[PDB]
Amino acid sequence: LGKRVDYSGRSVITVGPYLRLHQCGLPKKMALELFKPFIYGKLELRGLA
Amino acid sequence: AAQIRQLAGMRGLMAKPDGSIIETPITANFREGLNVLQYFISTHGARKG
Amino acid sequence: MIETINKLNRISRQMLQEMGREPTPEELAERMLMPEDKIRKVLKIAKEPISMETPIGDDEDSHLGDFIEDTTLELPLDS
């Protein structure tokens, strides 16, 4: 009924009032690890690797 | 208004964990500071809750 | 092999009463009259396996079988 899933993360939450109602912050060192195959697929398409 | 009463007026009537109401009340509030026995009486309700 | 284990364990029981310190294999081979690598070979066979449902803290929700990584899988970047 409940599994452990890939493409996942965990961090401490903090308040920020400059956002809009549909936005949220995200660290760079977290989105670099969650979006890694998307980054590979974009780096191969532009010929950068 | 139930928590401003515990800052100027007196604490109402604490109750020992048998369920019976203690006779003498906590006549001192959180600005004037509680007594030694009035702080020990005030721990039955907080530990219960 | 059980006799070779039990001679080592009887001699290692006697050496603790005699010397007072736990015997290293180098001084154990002197009593056993054996090469030291033989005694290091016999001291590897033992220690019957741990159950995979044993708890490794003092808990009861974290068993040992939730820590064993599967190694036979091919990596998704290497595939």
Partner: protein, 1338 residues
């Protein structure tokens, strides 16, 4: 004052005079292990009782025995400084002198055959360090206490809840220290029942027939006989008036000539007084009144027939006719009253199916051992060994002392076994409770709950370890060969060293030590757990055990506990509370003799407290001692009310004895709540020690006792003058009168520099004295991690304003200025430990080489010749610390790669890189590298120079140990020789070794010169012995785990600043997450230019009622106002008579202050050192319930030219306008906390799937993904998002042909779901199909 208290005198606001100082806070851990090791010939604590109870054991046939003589604890093989290095248990080998004797076969009592006496080794015991911290496998472990039921007797009663319509059933237990639990209980049919060891129910008089009692003696023991008389065919009874008291007069009560009582009469007490008045001896009664009376004896037919009736049979008219026929003039009946003397045993004796003794032991046998056919010889032994054996039952002198007291006996000493007088007394008291006299007891009385410390639990484990070898050696002595049997061979070191090492290291009470404070170390040892063996659990504890009983006052703290699932179970010992000799909790009081409160102190238990009347500590007092207010408030019998002066028997010691030690550091505890003041004491236990310590401006005066007694500072044993100060060692010259007559008089303290704690924080002792200054006894010479001139100092204090600032402090958030980040106020130091172990595979051994395949020069720049990283090299995430390669068995190859490796000549060998790398997101600096290696393995180049540096340091440290000590010894020689023989230059110009050669004339001075000479002669050889021992300890090969070649250990040193995410918290339970690090110019600033370092939130005060922080803020503002007045008066460099004119005016501003400090007796140089330590702010003490009032804060704020309201007019930073209202600004002592954000952040795309279930692992150190539990599966079902639910079950987690297709689709640039059945479903199919249940699909 002393000399070390003449810097930074903490101004006290306390008004109550203290009569007793705070005792040694670690008294329950150290004084309870000293009664486990030291030999006791008379009291039998510890190992001596455990030996003398089991030994002397004899042989089976009674032809030999093992006698016990004595034991002896050898020297520990290693010290504590290297047991934390090599990872071995800091223990002491236990030896014992045993005496085996052989008794002759044919001789009647023949002892003279042979006496064999030999010393036997048996296991080890782990010693205790000087703070209560056992060292098990290198990690420091602390055993907490336990709070369990005391042995004895216990009368309990359910309030209802079993049967309808009330009918409370009074049960009664007997709890021994070891054995079965005898139990009694009633029934709704008012019978009695016995439950031996919580088995099935049994009629209670079957344990009376087993004690060799007939049913005549059983009725005699419990009841009260009424004798009848039959003379000349008259039915006249005897009657004492005390029996007939409160019944219905269903007939006429008569006398010779005065009818005393009416008919139909509720018989009043005045009737009983009038019947008592004249005489009542013989009253004629109707015959029908006898019909309804049970007989007592066994009235038989004496002439011819058998018995007419036996005991416990009701007399009817025919049986009475038969008794008058056979002839009887004494008929005894049981006085059965309906309300006062119930017939409970008389009803039990009929439901009882047994009749005899040999038919009642069979019933106990068939209750306890069902399904086995009983014989008599095995039925007697079960009931004998159940209760009345010297090994299978034990109350052990606490159950006896608490057993004789509830039955109101007189003796205290008694046998550990039961008797046939204790069970009848228990049944009599239970029946008396059922009748109406006496009262039922309670379980939460703290005179019914003991404390069971370390030396009591290790002894009970040692006895089990002794029995596990007594079982073998009992049968070894009847196997034969009693001719050449020296007693060393029979006893093996397996079971005792298994049981002791199992307790020290695997129990629920031998837990890991929290070492990230001096406070958190000291409040983990005064912790009274209630769980563990013989206690409760977290799923079977209601609201009744977790509650604050009224006898917790002054023994166990009410506001120091965890708040998780075990909220009331983990208690905490109070400040002044001691442990009794039995185990109960006693607390001190002052005696009140005729209205004069004296100064002699009495320790009172929990049962002695509820009989007196005891005053509060807040009662007022005159000079000589008299209650001034003439009507005081007091406690008596668990309740509280007003009383008079002459009635009072006792008084509390001080106002700190109700709270714990971890909660008496909070200032203004009297103003807070009880919810938030709990989390203000749970979160003071987690403060990380910062870079440089800083004293708290508003303390409670308890900061001085916790720093000294925690064993984290370096205190001076003897007093004198400091001779040499380094950053590592401190050499102190002892004063003259504090010396011993065979010493050299130099104490050397070696401070411990940067090491690793258990919570991976720093430990570092800096000296605090200067070169050439006097030091008295018991001062603080070296402040540890969170100490500051001997004061405990966990966090740092900074400016705080209470205003909402653009939402950045929204819901308990904290907005931190940049000058907290710049000035290094909160930057902590963490020390990690990384280990790379090179094991032995079967395909050749592994190797640590600088050569690494498939890695260029850019990672091997910091690796040395031998392959281990340099000390002091700055590393980053991913860089290689130890280059270790492992051999790989040859594998098959895919054909296109086989084409590639024929196009080019690349042929990678069987080598394979599996080296140790720094984990990601970590900077640091390698500050320590340790290399262990197995015997018979050739060392590297680095492993040799490590050992050579250790040899050089062991040379240098012992040489400097000898040099300065000899230099002091020669001056001690010169001090006697110059006064004796005046040779100022003959002593000098000689060779300095020829002072022992020089000789004064025949006096005692020459004799003490010879004493110092023989001291030097001992010193010249103990250095050589210690040098040889340290050389043999260093150069020897190390012990290792089997299958290990060598182990490298690398110690990083991570320094961490504050980030957005780091949990910060005050002392009053106001937590927070740092949200934004502003620039300096954006913070609100007052009209003097100073910016505000923290902008807190003011909406957190009225919802939680912690108004302690506002008063602490105002008092901190007053303290820093005074401390800036002194800084202005020092920066002008005015005088020294001006500082004495002001600081003296600052040190007395209370009404009735305790301390009186005058700066007249201070010299004109000590005032400058004092005012140099008050430049940062005058420190202020405020005790717990003796606090500083609101008038004193306003009287102190007017001294340093500050606003009385405490609120100033802040200007904005951004726009430059000023706010409308004034804003509260002051100082709050802010802590850091161990929940940093660098250890919580974690992200994972793909890797390391599990073995059986093939779904990814769990844990940040395991690199696992978060759990998408069914609480979220319901929440995704409710949205209707079925395509996000199909993805988070198959293609993300559990499929095998699903993930590696989705990865190619995503890298290829085509997000398309490709489903499949999960692998966890066709493991469920195989595990249902293995039960013989055919389950398929269609």
């Amino acid at each position: 004052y002393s000399y070390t208290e003449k810097k930074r005198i903490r101004k006290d606001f306390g008004k109550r005079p203290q009569v007793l100082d705070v005792p040694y806070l670690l008294s329950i851990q150290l004084d309870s292990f000293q009664k486990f090791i030291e030999q006791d010939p008379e009291g039998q604590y510890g190992l001596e009782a455990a030996f003398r109870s089991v030994f002397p054991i004899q042989s089976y046939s009674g032809n030999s025995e093992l006698q016990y003589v004595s034991y002896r604890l050898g020297e520990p093989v290693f010290d504590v400084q290297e047991c934390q290095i090599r990872g071995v248990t800091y223990s002491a080998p236990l030896r014992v002198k045993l005496r085996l004797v052989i008794y002759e076969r044919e001789a009647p009592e023949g002892t003279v055959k042979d006496i064999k006496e030999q010393e036997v080794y048996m296991g080890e015991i782990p010693l205790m360090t000087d703070n209560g911290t056992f060292v098990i496998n290198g990690t420091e472990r602390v055993i907490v206490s336990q709070l369990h039921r005391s042995p004895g007797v216990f009368f309990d009663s359910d309030k209802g809840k079993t049967h309808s319509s009330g009918k409370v059933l009074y049960n009664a237990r007997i709890i021994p220290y070891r054995g079965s639990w005898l139990d009694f209980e009633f029934d709704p049919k008012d019978n009695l029942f016995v439950r031996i060891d919580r088995r099935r129910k049994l009629p209670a008089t079957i344990i009376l027939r087993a004690l060799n009692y007939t049913t005549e003696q059983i009725l005699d023991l419990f009841f009260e006989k009424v004798i009848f008389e039959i003379r000349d065919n008259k039915l006249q009874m005897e009657l004492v008036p005390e029996r007939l008291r409160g019944e219905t007069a269903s007939f006429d009560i008569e006398a010779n000539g005065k009818v005393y009582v009416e008919k139909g009469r509720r018989i009043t007490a005045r009737h009983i007084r009038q019947l008592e008045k004249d005489d009542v001896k013989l009253i004629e009664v109707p015959v029908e009144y006898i019909a309804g009376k049970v007989v007592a004896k066994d009235y038989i037919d004496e002439s011819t027939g058998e018995l007419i009736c036996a005991a416990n049979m009701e007399l009817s008219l025919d049986l009475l006719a038969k008794l008058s026929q056979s002839g009887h003039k004494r008929i005894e009946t049981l006085f059965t009253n309906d309300l006062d003397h119930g017939p409970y045993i008389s009803e039990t004796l009929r439901v009882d199916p047994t009749n005899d003794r040999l038919s009642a032991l069979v019933e106990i046998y068939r209750m306890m051992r069902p399904g086995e056919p009983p014989t008599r010889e095995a039925a007697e032994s079960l009931f004998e060994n159940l209760f009345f054996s010297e090994d299978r039952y034990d109350l052990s002198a606490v159950g006896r002392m608490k057993f004789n007291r509830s039955l109101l006996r007189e003796e205290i000493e008694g046998s550990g076994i039961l008797s046939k007088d204790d069970i009848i007394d228990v049944m009599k008291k239970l029946i008396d409770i059922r009748n109406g006299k006496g009262e039922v007891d309670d379980i939460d009385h703290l005179g019914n709950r003991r404390i069971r410390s370390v030396g009591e639990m290790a002894e009970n484990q040692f006895r089990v370890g002794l029995v596990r070898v007594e079982r073998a050696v009992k049968e070894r002595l009847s196997l034969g060969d009693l001719d050449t049997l020296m007693p060393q061979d029979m006893i093996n070191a397996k079971p005792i060293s298994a049981a002791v090492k199992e307790f020290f290291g695997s129990s629920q009470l031998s837990q890991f030590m929290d070492q990230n404070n001096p406070l958190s170390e000291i409040t983990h040892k005064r912790r009274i757990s209630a769980l563990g063996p013989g206690g409760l659990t977290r799923e079977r504890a209601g609201f009744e055990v977790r509650d604050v009983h009224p006898t917790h006052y002054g023994r166990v703290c009410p506001i120091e506990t965890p708040e998780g699932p075990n909220i009331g179970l983990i208690n905490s010992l109070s400040v002044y509370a001691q442990t009794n000799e039995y185990g109960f909790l006693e607390t001190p009081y002052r005696k009140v003799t005729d209205g004069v409160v004296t100064d002699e102190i009495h320790y009172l238990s929990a049962i002695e407290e509820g009989n007196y009347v005891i005053a509060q500590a807040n009662s007022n007092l005159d000079e000589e001692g008299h209650f001034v207010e003439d009507l005081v408030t007091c406690r008596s019998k668990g309740e509280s009310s007003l009383f008079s002066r002459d009635q009072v028997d006792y008084m509390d010691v001080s106002t700190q004895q109700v709270v714990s030690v971890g909660a008496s550091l909070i200032p203004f505890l009297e103003h807070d709540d009880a919810n938030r003041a709990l989390m203000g004491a749970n979160m003071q236990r987690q403060a990380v020690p910062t870079l440089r310590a800083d004293k708290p401006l508003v303390g409670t005066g308890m900061e001085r006792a916790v720093a000294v007694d925690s064993g984290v500072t370096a205190v001076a044993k003897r007093g004198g003058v400091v001779q040499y100060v380094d950053a590592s060692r401190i050499v102190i010259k002892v004063n003259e009168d504090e010396m011993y007559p065979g010493e050299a008089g130099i104490d050397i303290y070696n401070l411990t520099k940067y090491t690793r704690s258990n919570q991976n924080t720093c430990i570092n002792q800096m000296p605090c004295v200067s070169l050439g200054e006097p030091v008295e006894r018991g001062d603080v010479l070296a402040d540890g991690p969170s100490t500051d001139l001997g004061e405990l100092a966990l966090g740092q204090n900074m400016r705080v304003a209470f205003m909402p600032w653009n939402g950045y402090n929204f819901e308990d958030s904290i907005l931190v200025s940049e000058r907290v980040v710049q000035e290094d106020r909160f930057t902590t130091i963490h020390i990690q430990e990384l280990a790379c172990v090179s094991r032995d595979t079967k395909l050749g051994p592994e190797e640590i080489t600088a050569d690494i395949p498939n890695v260029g020069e850019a990672a091997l720049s910091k690796l040395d010749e031998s392959g281990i990283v340099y000390i002091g090299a700055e590393v980053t995430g991913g860089d290689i610390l130890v280059g270790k390669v492992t051999p790989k068995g040859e594998t098959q190859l895919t054909p296109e790669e086989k084409l590639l490796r024929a196009i080019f000549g690349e042929k990678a060998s069987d080598v394979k890189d599996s080296s140790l790398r720094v984990p990601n997101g970590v900077s640091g600096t390698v500050i320590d590298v340790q290399v262990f290696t197995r015997d018979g393995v050739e060392k590297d180049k680095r492993a040799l120079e490590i050992e050579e540096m250790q040899l050089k340091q062991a040379k240098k440290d012992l040489s400097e140990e000898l040099q300065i000590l000899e230099a002091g010894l020669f001056s001690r020689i010169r001090a006697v020789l110059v006064a004796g023989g005046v040779e100022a230059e003959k002593l000098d110009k000689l060779p300095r070794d020829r002072w022992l050669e020089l000789g004064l004339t025949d006096e005692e001075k020459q004799n003490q010169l010879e004493q110092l000479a023989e001291q030097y002669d001992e010193l010249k050889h103990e250095f050589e012995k210690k040098l040889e021992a340290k050389r043999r300890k260093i150069t020897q090969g190390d012990d290792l785990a089997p299958g290990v070649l060598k182990i490298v250990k690398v110690y990083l040193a991570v320094k961490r600043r504050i980030q957005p995410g780091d949990k910060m918290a005050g002392r009053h339970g106001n937590k927070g997450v740092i949200s934004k690090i502003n620039p300096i110019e954006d913070m609100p600033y007052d009209e003097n230019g100073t910016p505000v370092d923290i902008v807190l939130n003011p909406l957190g005060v009225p919802s939680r009622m912690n108004i302690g922080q506002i008063l602490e803020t105002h008092l901190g503002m007053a303290a820093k106002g005074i401390g800036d007045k002194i800084n202005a008066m020092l920066k002008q460099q005015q005088e020294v008579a001006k500082l004495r004119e002001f600081i003296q005016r600052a040190y007395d501003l209370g009404a009735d202050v305790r301390q009186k400090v005058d700066l007249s007796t201070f010299s004109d140089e000590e005032v400058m050192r004092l005012a140099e330590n008050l430049r940062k702010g005058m420190p202020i003490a405020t005790p717990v319930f003796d606090g500083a009032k609101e008038a004193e804060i306003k009287e102190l704020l007017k001294l340093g030219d500050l606003p009385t309201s405490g609120q100033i007019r802040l200007y904005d930073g951004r726009t430059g306008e000023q706010f409308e209202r004034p804003v509260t600004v002051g100082y709050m002592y802010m802590l850091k906390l161990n929940h940093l954000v660098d250890d919580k952040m974690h992200a994972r795309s793909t890797g390391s799937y599990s073995l059986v279930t093939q779904q990814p692992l769990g844990g940040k150190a395991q690199f696992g993904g978060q759990r998408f539990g069914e609480m979220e599966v319901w929440a995704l079902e409710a949205y209707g998002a079925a395509y996000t639910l199909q993805e988070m079950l198959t293609v993300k987690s559990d499929d095998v042909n699903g993930r590696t297709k989705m990865y190619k689709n995503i890298v290829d640039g085509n997000h398309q779901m490709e489903p499949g059945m999960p692998e966890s479903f066709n493991v469920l199919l195989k595990e249902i199909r293995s039960l013989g249940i055919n389950i398929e699909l269609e």
